[PDB]
């Protein structure tokens, strides 16, 4: 019709940059302070490849103590950004737990997902680009290197996810 709608969920360990990526997409601003999330939601209209879309984006908690809220957003969400920080190897190892829970909750092996390696503006890193690309290939999904600080790859991560859901629906 006139508009399409996509339910996107941003997931990953605490402090990797989920809120900063979302806020850079929606407000065109970089958040320097770390305000740990419980659960925030945004709705933003965009045009992706000529399609007017309303993106409903849920910005989730990385802190372990909010893990009981995962089942609900996993059932609802249509696509997931699996975010890790390239200087946080623990957050990269935690990606598998999120992908496994999504798979179990949605009872599906083809749920739209994108692996995101954030903080690409840093001068050093502990997770190699090849290591993250290798994991994303094992999942059959794209991997995007982003910087919420410089805005590099931010639209690429969210729009690649929208394109995957659009294709999934067909």
């Amino acid at each position: 019709g006139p508009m399409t709608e996509y339910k996107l969920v941003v997931v990953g360990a605490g402090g990797v940059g989920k809120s900063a990526l979302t806020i850079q997409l929606i407000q065109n601003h970089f958040v320097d302070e770390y305000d740990p999330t419980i659960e925030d939601s945004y709705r933003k209209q965009v045009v992706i490849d000529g399609e007017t879309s309303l993106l409903d984006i849920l910005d989730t908690a990385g802190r372990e103590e909010y893990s009981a809220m995962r089942d609900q957003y996993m059932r609802t969400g249509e696509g997931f950004l699996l975010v890790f920080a390239i200087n946080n190897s623990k957050s990269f190892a935690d990606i598998n737990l999120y992908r496994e829970q999504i798979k179990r909750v949605k009872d599906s092996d083809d749920v739209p997902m994108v692996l995101v390696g954030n903080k690409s503006d840093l001068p050093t890193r502990t997770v190699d680009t090849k290591q993250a690309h290798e994991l994303a290939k094992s999942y059959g999904i794209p991997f995007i290197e982003t910087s919420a600080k410089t805005r590099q790859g931010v639209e690429d991560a969210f729009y690649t996810l929208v394109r995957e859901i659009r294709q999934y629906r067909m």
Partner: peptide, 15 residues
């Protein structure tokens, strides 16, 4: 910044 599942390992597509 995009590394597709079919791309050479660590090679991004910028087109």
């Amino acid at each position: 910044f995009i590394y597709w599942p079919w791309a050479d390992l660590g090679v991004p597509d910028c087109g």
